[PDB]
Design a protein around this ligand. Structure first.
Ligand SMILES: *C(=C)C1=C(C)[C@@H](Cc2[nH]c(/C=C3N=C(/C=C4\NC(=O)[C@H](C)[C@H]4[C@@H](*)C)C(C)=C\3CCC(=O)O)c(CCC(=O)O)c2C)NC1=O
Ligand SMILES: *C(=C)C1=C(C)[C@@H](Cc2[nH]c(/C=C3N=C(/C=C4\NC(=O)[C@H](C)[C@H]4[C@@H](*)C)C(C)=C\3CCC(=O)O)c(CCC(=O)O)c2C)NC1=O
Ligand SMILES: *C(=C)C1=C(C)[C@@H](Cc2[nH]c(/C=C3N=C(/C=C4\NC(=O)[C@H](C)[C@H]4[C@@H](*)C)C(C)=C\3CCC(=O)O)c(CCC(=O)O)c2C)NC1=O
Ligand SMILES: *C(=C)C1=C(C)[C@@H](Cc2[nH]c(/C=C3N=C(/C=C4\NC(=O)[C@H](C)[C@H]4[C@@H](*)C)C(C)=C\3CCC(=O)O)c(CCC(=O)O)c2C)NC1=O
Ligand SMILES: *[C@@H](C)[C@H]1/C(=C/C2=NC(=C\c3[nH]c(C[C@H]4NC(=O)C(C=C)=C4C)c(C)c3CCC(=O)O)/C(CCC(=O)O)=C2C)NC(=O)[C@@H]1C
Ligand SMILES: *[C@@H](C)[C@H]1/C(=C/C2=NC(=C\c3[nH]c(C[C@H]4NC(=O)C(C=C)=C4C)c(C)c3CCC(=O)O)/C(CCC(=O)O)=C2C)NC(=O)[C@@H]1C
Ligand SMILES: *[C@@H](C)[C@H]1/C(=C/C2=NC(=C\c3[nH]c(C[C@H]4NC(=O)C(C=C)=C4C)c(C)c3CCC(=O)O)/C(CCC(=O)O)=C2C)NC(=O)[C@@H]1C
Ligand SMILES: *[C@H](C)[C@H]1/C(=C/C2=NC(=C\c3[nH]c(C[C@H]4NC(=O)C(C=C)=C4C)c(C)c3CCC(=O)O)/C(CCC(=O)O)=C2C)NC(=O)[C@@H]1C
Ligand SMILES: *[C@H](C)[C@H]1/C(=C/C2=NC(=C\c3[nH]c(C[C@H]4NC(=O)C(C=C)=C4C)c(C)c3CCC(=O)O)/C(CCC(=O)O)=C2C)NC(=O)[C@@H]1C
Ligand SMILES: *[C@H](C)[C@H]1/C(=C/C2=NC(=C\c3[nH]c(C[C@H]4NC(=O)C(C=C)=C4C)c(C)c3CCC(=O)O)/C(CCC(=O)O)=C2C)NC(=O)[C@@H]1C
Ligand SMILES: *[C@H](C)[C@H]1/C(=C/C2=NC(=C\c3[nH]c(C[C@H]4NC(=O)C(C=C)=C4C)c(C)c3CCC(=O)O)/C(CCC(=O)O)=C2C)NC(=O)[C@@H]1C
Ligand SMILES: *[C@H](C)[C@H]1/C(=C/C2=NC(=C\c3[nH]c(C[C@H]4NC(=O)C(C=C)=C4C)c(C)c3CCC(=O)O)/C(CCC(=O)O)=C2C)NC(=O)[C@@H]1C
Ligand SMILES: *[C@H](C)[C@H]1/C(=C/C2=NC(=C\c3[nH]c(C[C@H]4NC(=O)C(C=C)=C4C)c(C)c3CCC(=O)O)/C(CCC(=O)O)=C2C)NC(=O)[C@@H]1C
Ligand SMILES: *[C@H](C)[C@H]1/C(=C/C2=NC(=C\c3[nH]c(C[C@H]4NC(=O)C(C=C)=C4C)c(C)c3CCC(=O)O)/C(CCC(=O)O)=C2C)NC(=O)[C@@H]1C
Lengths: 184, 164, 164, 184, 164, 184, 184, 164
């Protein structure tokens, strides 16, 4: 896999040149602590996220839990909860590395085809991914609602800035989007 | 490609884990240490031709026989390729400083090197002398901070040891 | 046991590598971060009984049915053991702050826990509740520094997620 | 494997107690940067050390390279150089972790047996290890002699203190001593 | 799906064997025992709603805290799904009675069940109590023959054990 | 794999319904002893069946045992013999189960592709399976001819009824037809 | 593995002679339905038996759940519960078969030395097995007390005879005693 | 040793299962069928010498050439061992009737028989002929009940197939 830095290294090597543009990387560094918070925010809330999202996917489409539904019977429900967790896990890897390659390589590569063979519904998988995308954004900004969380609400307590890390939220979202783009 | 983060990520994946406490700690080390090795990276980027030139000069000075008929520094092509080679290693060290792990040097420099030099009758001692000269060459704070020189030197020794 | 240094050593050993750049950098992270987690660890060590008492109190308050005859908080022995269990988790957490990796909690707390509670018919929700109370309880700078609290809360969330 | 800190936790777990004395541990942190230089000093000069140590073993016992000698023929010599480097590599792991368990568990365990079975001489191995012990100390203190190094002399350029990391020298030397002990 | 015949066919196939003595014998067992399990199967098929309703009723009566705010039997939807779940288990038992093996129960009920209930925070005691009620409820010759009831009960214990 | 009963269960689960109609199931039970006799009849004469069926495939097509023929040389003949037996074995499993799934999943799945890559002549394969089908039917009815059997004639001595297990003969034949069907 | 019948055959084959006594095998068949009830009695109550037996082992020896105890920490408790269940399971295999060999070959052989290498305490292991022996006897006789079972009481409903299957109870106990003999 | 019960036990053990519904049903098959096969085993135990003798006689009368010098029935020792061999198979068949599975015949007779007979230049047609005679010889109810004879014949045909 690559990280944000070895990515720049690969791009430079393509013309056998030294790395001279050391501004984006310096920037990456200066927001290093925020990145760590962003990752910590998702990982710490990963179980609540996964179950909320798959449950959210189901509550919007009861088809999934009826006869012939792809979350019926128990083992399929378990399998789906498992997959949701796997995708979230790789996305968080991508965010920690600040590069999508680990996600493309070890998770998304051949995923659509696998789901096609199994008859795992594309629409529904994408939805679950969309719900986690919205979850991750909220936790990174540290603005989750009590409305969506209830008694399981969690506050990260990171040093607040005005844009509440808008850049990292965009990055994280762009990884979930790679998932969605892959599954469709 | 091996860095601080790709290493903890690969280990986490092997165990099916989310990034945890020790993974975040590890990357904070990469945060801490980046200033030193990026300083080295920037200095090396700005001055790579000169650094490579004088290391190349030193290795030919150590081994003038390389200039003899049919030896590896004996023609204009060979001389040009030898300097290029020294430069290659220094650029790969610039990459490794940027990455914060031996990845770039492992994959594009070290892997295959002994096969290549064996096949072409290229003596390895001049390589080692070019890199050793460059390893003994820098001093702080003239060239860079002491901690930046530490990073620079560590990657030179790593290259040296890979040939030794 | 998983820590920053044991993780990079194991990765090193697997590839037959001496410690190199990215390995030392990782340990520099452990160095930078120790003050935080050791502050939390020190605070936790000094007050573990009060901290676990009120977590235990909070989970019993969430589930008064546990007090009814034949339920898991119904007798003096069960009561003492339920408090003890919360304190076990809090102690493994103190350990994991000392180590700077989830090792002690993984191997001595999480491993096997679901088998044990299932076999003894112990509902998991009171465990999650005790830990959630603990997770929401701290505030900085009152209790400890903001980074120490961050370390403390991550281990609580880690344990919560293991039961969730 | 264990490290310095999880070793402390193992001791505390024997009485199911919290870790209360962090004085030895705070110190380990305080000498953190030293530990890394010490490791850097060994790893950076590993190749020189191994060849110099094996060569030293041999120049002091010519029987190793004569008929029936355990460094004869080329593949025995190669095997020996390999073993010397393996041993050093695990010592460097233990110095990095502040604990001998990685060394004991992955290297030394069954080593005496293996050597016994192969006819690898204990005495010569010990002396090779003794030389590596001497080298690492000098390199940790950053006082290698030009008498022993010639053109291959390396200076690490770490901040000098009066005792030149004597407690790290003692610890590293205890790791080498463990090796010798496992063979005795 | 595990039954008498698929078990022996799978064993025969693994050793590359034609069906032989012990395989025909095993199947003779299915024939002899079918009357009893098919009796229970029909009784259950005709009355599963009532059977599941009272088992469901018993687990809520046992754990009224499930009716509390935020708890698993608290809303109309939650309530329907819990009764539904009790009926799922009983229908899989009906299937297993027809097959004469735990196959249907294993694959469509037990497999993945602990992971689902852990993720959704569903307490397993009420599942165990509905099934224990059902297990203790029947008597012969009133509800079916003694041999039919033995089959019915054995599969309830099987489901109960899978959750314990 | 499935059997006659779990096949019914699978069909009920498609609408998450209890199995209500046990009519075919009750009949399967009542004819249970018959089924065991019919499986005994085939298993007991399997070797005579396989050899007679392969030899008859051959006597009707001498090309198979001339240069270029797929039953030439010895190792191809051996391989064919083996395939005929493997096929018969999976047909007996199906007959004992009262369902073709084990036949389908473990034998017929990908058989066509396997034969096409090796150059196994479908036409001839079909003939061997046809002969086994005729044999099986006669052994189930316990009416093999001396004409086709000679000194190797066997009688099962099962209790005779009017139709001589007509329904089980048709079922057995349907498994052989599926074999032939799987080939295209 | 052997069963009650193949046990007779092995004994006969040791003098290459036919199995001549069957009356004792006839009696085995005579109590065949009984044996199936005895097994159903243990299997259907296995979870309650293991948790109760391991709990009793502990409540009689608190050292096991204190510091250094062999049921501390969680993974050790989980291992022990696992071992009690594994032992109970092989015991029911032996009772189903009417022969100890499966218990001997797959479970008990090597077990004492496995436990000595781990330091799994003999006295506590025996007691756990003792309790499961007492449980098994009561469930086979279908006379478990409310005192020991509380709300978990289970009654099997099998046809009662005067001796309440005394020889099967004695036989079951003999297998538990084999376990205890093997391990102490 | 393959019987009805060891087959289901082995399958349960491979899946780490307690005996369950399909396993007990299988053993019920053994209860049901044992009368027939124990009847055959008892008849064989009482008359095995006479049964073997004539099967032996029949194969020699079929292949007189075996009596020629150098051939397998030409000496007294050869004659005695050929009869003995036929009795061996019949004894193993007697064991398999008792066990209710092909186990005894598989392990003690069939395993290795082709290697042995090949090595010692023993033709297999006379073996098959002795067993075929024995298989065609019985009739019910003269020799035993129809179902006892079915069991007897199935094992003879099993042996025959193993040599064919
Ligand atoms: C079905 C009845 C149904 C649902 C289930 C639910 C699914 C859902 N959830 C969200 C949004 C979020 N969920 C979050 C999860 C959590 N918040 C926490 O604090 C804890 C740790 C965790 C577990 C409960 C978070 C943080 C969000 C972000 C939004 C917010 O905080 O308000 C959505 C919205 C997704 C979207 O944007 O499309 C949905 C659909 N909703 C249901 O209807
Ligand atoms: C055979 C004739 C023979 C030898 C070969 C040699 C072996 C030997 N070496 C030492 C001590 C050291 N060797 C060192 C190695 C190095 N120093 C460097 O700067 C480079 C990187 C590296 C390779 C050359 C070092 C640092 C030492 C420490 C001592 C010192 O620095 O002076 C010994 C002494 C071992 C001891 O002290 O017991 C020996 C025997 N000697 C031979 O006789
Ligand atoms: C080549 C010259 C040639 C053949 C070889 C032979 C192949 C063949 N065989 C049949 C039919 C049957 N064979 C049977 C086999 C046996 N019966 C027994 O009693 C013993 C145990 C066993 C081995 C000899 C049986 C039972 C039949 C069914 C017919 C019957 O019983 O009369 C066919 C006919 C297949 C069909 O109808 O399509 C063929 C072609 N025939 C050859 O020409
Ligand atoms: C610790 C304080 C402690 C215990 C825990 C408990 C352990 C124990 N249990 C028994 C005896 C039995 N337990 C049984 C189990 C069950 N009966 C049921 O109906 C359900 C299915 C199942 C789980 C609860 C049974 C059947 C018995 C047999 C005796 C009886 O009267 O039923 C003992 C006694 C064992 C012996 O005699 O050695 C012990 C110690 N006791 C504790 O003190
Ligand atoms: C004994 C080993 C040596 C010696 C070591 C000292 N090092 C000291 C400080 C120091 N070293 C480093 C480099 C180290 N830290 C890292 O993070 C990495 C790699 C990622 C490495 C290789 C740093 C950054 C520092 C701190 C800054 C500084 O002090 O300049 C040091 C002084 C601190 C202390 O006393 O512990 C010592 C003594 N010094 C010696 O005398 C022998 C030769
Ligand atoms: C078509 C297959 C046959 C045929 C079969 C019939 N068999 C009948 C009864 C029967 N068969 C067996 C043997 C079988 N049961 C077993 O358990 C085992 C091995 C474990 C085997 C091989 C038994 C025991 C019985 C019952 C005997 C009894 O009455 O006690 C039968 C009559 C019953 C019915 O009508 O179904 C038939 C017709 N008969 C035929 O005509 C063709 C040749
Ligand atoms: C000691 C274990 C018990 C006890 C047992 C008795 N059971 C008797 C008869 C019986 N049990 C079954 C069920 C069994 N057969 C199966 O095929 C299967 C599963 C496939 C199982 C679990 C049947 C079918 C029968 C026969 C019908 C009947 O008797 O009602 C029995 C009476 C026969 C005998 O004396 O051996 C006894 C004594 N009885 C006891 O007192 C303790 C509690
Ligand atoms: C959940 C939101 C979905 C859903 C998911 C299901 N997936 C099923 C099986 C399955 N999933 C994967 C992909 C997963 N495994 C990986 O290793 C990685 C990445 C590295 C991923 C994302 C695989 C390979 C498989 C097949 C093997 C297996 O069972 O794990 C599955 C079971 C399908 C079945 O067998 O019927 C389900 C239900 N299903 C849904 O309804 C929502 C949309
Ligand atoms: C410290 C006082 C040393 C010492 C240092 C000197 N270096 C001199 C020249 C020189 N050095 C380099 C290598 C340097 N430039 C880089 O860009 C990097 C790494 C990226 C390094 C290590 C170059 C290319 C040059 C030539 C151009 C220049 O002047 O910088 C130097 C001038 C005299 C000379 O050429 O030797 C000094 C004094 N000299 C010492 O005696 C102590 C040990
Ligand atoms: C910040 C203003 C919060 C808030 C904090 C309060 N905490 C109070 C008491 C309290 N908190 C703890 C947990 C703390 N002690 C520890 O040792 C550790 C970790 C090692 C932690 C996180 C304890 C044990 C106690 C009781 C003893 C004590 O007060 O020190 C507290 C007093 C009132 C109360 O008990 O609730 C406050 C106000 N409260 C808030 O509203 C914001 C969010
Ligand atoms: C034996 C005399 C028992 C006993 C039995 C009673 N059961 C009563 C009602 C009842 N039981 C069931 C469960 C039963 N029905 C089924 O369809 C199946 C399985 C397929 C089972 C096990 C139901 C659904 C009902 C309600 C409808 C009905 O009456 O059949 C009952 C009436 C009073 C009551 O409801 O409890 C009795 C007496 N009661 C005993 O005391 C002994 C131990
Ligand atoms: C005989 C009636 C045919 C015939 C058959 C040949 N098959 C040859 C190879 C072969 N067949 C199979 C399928 C078989 N193996 C299985 O595992 C299963 C089901 C579980 C089946 C049906 C395989 C996989 C293979 C390749 C491996 C092997 O050699 O055994 C074959 C040899 C071809 C060659 O190597 O040239 C032959 C001759 N040939 C005939 O002429 C008639 C029609
Ligand atoms: C419970 C009553 C005991 C107790 C048990 C423990 N056993 C531990 C490990 C262990 N047990 C076995 C034997 C088990 N594995 C098998 O495959 C079979 C039979 C087929 C059996 C009986 C093995 C082989 C092992 C070690 C490997 C493994 O764990 O799988 C254990 C953990 C020991 C440790 O790691 O320290 C415990 C605690 N302990 C008790 O206190 C009571 C007496
Ligand atoms: C049915 C009427 C047959 C038929 C039967 C005959 N068998 C005769 C003699 C005979 N058979 C056996 C084998 C038998 N004895 C056993 O112990 C067992 C299995 C354990 C079997 C299968 C023997 C050893 C003997 C000789 C001693 C005896 O008479 O029982 C027989 C007498 C004339 C003869 O020997 O051929 C008859 C008539 N014969 C038939 O034609 C129908 C088809």
């Amino acid at each position: 896999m690559l990280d944000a830095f070895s990515r720049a290294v690969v791009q430079a090597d393509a013309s056998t040149s030294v790395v001279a543009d050391m501004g984006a990387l310096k920037q990456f560094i200066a927001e290093g602590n925020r990145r760590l918070d962003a990752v910590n925010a998702i990982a710490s809330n990963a179980s609540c996220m996964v179950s909320d999202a798959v449950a959210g996917m189901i509550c919007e489409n009861q088809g999934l839990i009826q006869a012939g539904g792809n979350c019926y019977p128990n083992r399929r429900m378990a399998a789906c909860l498992r997959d949701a967790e796997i995708i979230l896990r790789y996305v968080t890897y991508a965010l920690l590395a600040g590069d999508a390659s680990v996600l493309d390589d070890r998770c998304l590569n051949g995923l659509k085809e696998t789901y096609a063979a199994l008859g795992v519904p594309t629409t529904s998988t994408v939805r679950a991914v969309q719900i986690m995308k919205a979850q991750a954004a909220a936790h990174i900004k540290d603005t989750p609602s009590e409305a969506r969380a209830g008694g399981k609400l969690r506050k990260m307590g990171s040093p607040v800035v005005e844009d509440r890390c808008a850049s990292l939220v965009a990055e994280a979202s762009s990884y979930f989007d790679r998932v969605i783009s892959a599954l469709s | 490609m091996k860095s601080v983060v790709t290493t903890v990520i690969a280990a986490a994946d092997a165990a099916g884990r989310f990034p945890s406490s020790s993974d975040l700690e590890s990357v904070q080390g990469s945060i801490q240490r980046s200033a030193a090795r990026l300083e080295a990276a920037e200095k090396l980027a700005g001055n790579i031709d000169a650094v490579a030139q004088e290391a190349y000069n030193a290795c030919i000075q150590k081994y003038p026989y390389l200039n003899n008929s049919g030896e590896a520094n004996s023609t204009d092509t060979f001389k040009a390729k030898c300097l290029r080679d020294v430069k290659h290693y220094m650029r790969l060290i610039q990459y490794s400083l940027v990455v914060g792990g031996t990845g770039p040097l492992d994959e594009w420099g070290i892997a295959g090197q002994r096969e290549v030099y064996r096949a072409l009758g290229l003596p390895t001692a001049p390589y080692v002398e070019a890199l050793s000269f460059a390893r003994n060459r820098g001093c702080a704070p003239r060239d860079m901070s002491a901690q930046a020189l530490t990073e620079y030197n560590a990657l030179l020794d790593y290259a040296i040891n890979s040939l030794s």
